[PDB]
Design a protein around this ligand. Structure first.
Ligand code: THM
Ligand code: THM
Lengths: 185, 190
């Protein structure tokens, strides 16, 4: 019997490519804070790990920092997934799943994560599912074309990267809990 | 309430420097397999992670492989610490604790683990003790002088490394610098 079993309300995961308008989408839920546990992607944690900016170090030098960075992402995800709450609904931006199935996978594919590094991350994921409870009742997929995503980012990463991520999200969420697809172009 | 709470028997951890004679010591317990859950240090796992030898890659190029290797060590330790068993006594060679307090710490000190890497490992350890139950009722410390340890290895790593490790084991198990979890029982391997 897993950690945090039966301690979690109905949980909705917001999934989508970089620049699919997740942050904008989640701001619409702001006014229900008293009723909804609302956890945005923990970027602030990744950018300040006792002063160290793992996210930056990763984009700067992936062959070296992808492994610890992704490892840290996994941790922060679990921190959100298990964080206790009294509310009757929980909404999370991204998840341990997008981290594993899209980001880690893509990093392996383009050789940022070497085999041994990928294998370590994966061994953890396998242990994590046997030991920690990840509540997930509904995914909302903010589906977009990579080009529209690319555009949105410019008004505020290569298109090729966004394409790769998009394909991986599609493999996971379309081509295969219940997924619910929204058009955000 | 943590994972694997109340699923574990009395647990003894065998701790000591590289070459303190842990493997030899644990072989004496072999003949009680039916009565004792007896888990040796999972080196085999570290040497074959879907074909990859993490242990080797670590000694070959520490700045790059220490982080994943130690991360993997942590995992295998947890795998042992929580592995279910019907026996009334469990004996583990090394532990999540030696990994954290001695090996990871030393790797930070000599710059194998860079700050961000160390910090990630530590954040995990902190999350791990809030979420996973690590049963530990008694530590047996195979205490030795680094020189004797060094000698034992030759009959079968720099002396400076063994010295550093020894000092860290001593800080943890004798001088009680780190958080204690249970009673330490010291043996002289001489
Ligand atoms: C969840 C997740 C996000 N990200 C990134 C992509 C974006 O650059 C940034 C903000 O989400 O974080 C990863 O790199 N890996 C991950 O596993
Ligand atoms: C437990 C542990 C062992 N080891 C090493 C030291 C020894 O050379 C080898 C077999 O014990 O594995 C680590 O490097 N880190 C660890 O955390």
């Amino acid at each position: 019997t897993k950690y945090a079993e039966g301690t979690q309300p109905f949980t909705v995961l917001i999934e989508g490519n970089i620049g699919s308008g997740k942050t904008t989408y989640l701001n619409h839920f702001e006014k229900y804070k008293n009723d909804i546990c609302l956890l945005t992607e923990p970027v602030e944690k990744w950018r300040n790990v006792n002063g160290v900016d793992l996210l930056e170090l990763m984009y700067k030098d992936p062959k070296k920092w992808a492994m610890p960075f992704q490892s840290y992402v996994t941790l922060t995800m679990l921190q959100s997934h298990t964080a206790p709450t009294n509310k009757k609904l929980k909404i999370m931006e991204r998840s341990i799943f997008s981290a594993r199935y899209c980001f880690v996978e893509n990093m392996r594919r383009n050789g940022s994560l070497e085999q041994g590094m990928y294998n370590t991350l994966e061994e953890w994921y396998k242990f994590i599912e046997e030991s920690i409870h990840v509540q997930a009742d509904l995914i909302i997929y903010l589906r977009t074309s990579p080009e529209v995503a690319y555009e949105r980012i410019r008004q505020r990463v290569p298109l090729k990267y966004l394409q790769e991520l998009h394909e991986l999200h599609e493999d996971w969420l379309i081509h295969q809990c219940k997924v619910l697809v929204l058009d955000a172009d």
